[PDB]
């Protein structure tokens, strides 16, 4: 019952942006994964629960984005909080 989630880190022209340090956290606060963006979509598979994508560092010339909180529900659908 794991739901596929596609994460894109982009610039304002809508192109994939490399160089951003990112964490995905669950509702407890547990860091599920930490990576640096590399210019492609990042795929995760997540069970029901509430999670947060957090930008911990932005590449030079770029501003740190506000964290994105989302929920995957028991029906497999995803919602942004």
């Amino acid at each position: 019952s794991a739901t596929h989630i596609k994460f894109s880190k982009r610039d304002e022209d809508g192109k994939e942006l490399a160089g951003a340090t990112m964490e995905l956290r669950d509702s407890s606060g547990k860091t599920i994964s930490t990576w640096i963006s590399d210019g492609q979509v990042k795929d995760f598979y997540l069970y029901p629960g509430k999670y947060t994508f957090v930008e911990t560092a932005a590449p030079d010339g770029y501003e740190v984005a506000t964290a994105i909180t989302f929920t995957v529900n028991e029906q497999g659908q995803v919602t942004v909080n």
Partner: peptide, 12 residues
């Protein structure tokens, strides 16, 4: 599902 996060440009 798609999550899209944009990094805005800094000014100058």
């Amino acid at each position: 599902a798609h999550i899209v996060m944009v990094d805005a440009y800094k000014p100058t």
